[PDB]
Amino acid sequence: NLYFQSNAMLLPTDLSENSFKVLEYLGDFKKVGVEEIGVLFVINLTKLGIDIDHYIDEMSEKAEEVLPEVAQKIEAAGIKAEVIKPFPAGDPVVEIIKASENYSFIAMGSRGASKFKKILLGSVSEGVLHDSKVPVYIFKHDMVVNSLFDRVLVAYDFSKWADRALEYAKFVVKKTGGELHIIHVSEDGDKTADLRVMEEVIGAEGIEVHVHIESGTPHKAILAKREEINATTIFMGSRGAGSVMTMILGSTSESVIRRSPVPVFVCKRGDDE
Ligand SMILES: Nc1ncnc2c1ncn2[C@@H]1O[C@H](COP(=O)(O)O)[C@@H](O)[C@H]1O
Ligand SMILES: [Cl-]
Numbered sequence: 164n165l166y167f168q169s170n171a172m173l174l175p176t177d178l179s180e181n182s183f184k185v186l187e188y189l190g191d192f193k194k195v196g197v198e199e200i201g202v203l204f205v206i207n208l209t210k211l212g213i214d215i216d217h218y219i220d221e222m223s224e225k226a227e228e229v230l231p232e233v234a235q236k237i238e239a240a241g242i243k244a245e246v247i248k249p250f251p252a253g254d255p256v257v258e259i260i261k262a263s264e265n266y267s268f269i270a271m272g273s274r275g276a277s278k279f280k281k282i283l284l285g286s287v288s289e290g291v292l293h294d295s296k297v298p299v300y301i302f303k304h305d306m307v308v309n310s311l312f313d314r315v316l317v318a319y320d321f322s323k324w325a326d327r328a329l330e331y332a333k334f335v336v337k338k339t340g341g342e343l344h345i346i347h348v349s350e351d352g353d354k355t356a357d358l359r360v361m362e363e364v365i366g367a368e369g370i371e372v373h374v375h376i377e378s379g380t381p382h383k384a385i386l387a388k389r390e391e392i393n394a395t396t397i398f399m400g401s402r403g404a405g406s407v408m409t410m411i412l413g414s415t416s417e418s419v420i421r422r423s424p425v426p427v428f429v430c431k432r433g434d435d436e
């Protein structure tokens with residue numbers, strides 16, 4: 164495959180500070196092949212007591228003041244920028260997913276809300292993560308700019324989603340010369356032997372790889388590992404099962420993504436999907 168190679172990247176924004184964190188990593192994305200970024204602002208009608216055409220207009224004017232700054236910063240990094248127009252009005256989650264059919268992946272922010280606040284107030288990032296078919300990359304902080312793919316940690320369970328997460332990971336580590344780290348969590352249903360074998364095969368493929376077997380709650384073991392080896396990003400897979408509600412309440416990805424100090428890339432389909 165081409166992975167990030169010649170990628171168009173979808174960048175949703177509600178103009179919030181958290182939505183712009185992605186922009187601190189433009190150098191990292193350029194170095195893996197991202198060549199164009201589509202910037203998507205949605206007039207959020209979902210929330211709606213007040214007239215809903217002055218609102219489209221209020222919102223449109225705000226975007227037009229700010230988005231050119233976004234476009235500017237992208238151009239300055241030597242990446243093509245397109246402010247998507249006209250601005251869709253409706254549900255941000257639906258409009259983002261709709262638009263994403265035209266892109267290789269989605270890079271977006273999150274306010275890092277607790278499970279409770281996500282449920283109470285809504286979470287665009289969880290909605291997107293739940294239904295997206297392209298990968299979704301969540302950025303909250305700038306702790307690892309210029310180092311994004313130096314130490315990639317892959318949460319890996321042999322599933323088709325993890326498999327493709329591993330392949331993206333191998334791609335970036337090959338591009339940037341970093342280190343690949345693979346963690347698999349499980350009490351048993353022992354797959355240690357196979358994982359060890361893969362460490363060896365991947366080493367032979369010219370990549371520096373370290374495999375980690377761990378016990379306990381998945382999100383706990385994953386974050387603990389990230390700290391232990393100072394991973395610069397976490398790659399993982401998600402089948403997006405159940406409902407948004409169910410994902411928020413009990414998914415491994417919601418917890419990992421929420422408490423992670425580094426960006427989390429989430430693969431949303433297998434190679435043969
Ligand atoms: N009206 C909107 N238009 C475009 N993107 C949005 C909008 N609202 C939220 N988002 C995206 O959702 C992220 C926040 O995720 P969350 O905190 O889970 O709602 C923001 O950083 C944006 O990337
Ligand atoms: Cl795992």
Ligand SMILES: [Cl-]
Nearest residue numbers: 380381382415
């Ligand atoms: Cl978990």
Ligand SMILES: [Cl-]
Nearest residue numbers: 273275420421
């Ligand atoms: Cl979050």
Ligand SMILES: [Cl-]
Nearest residue numbers: 303304425426
């Ligand atoms: Cl982050």
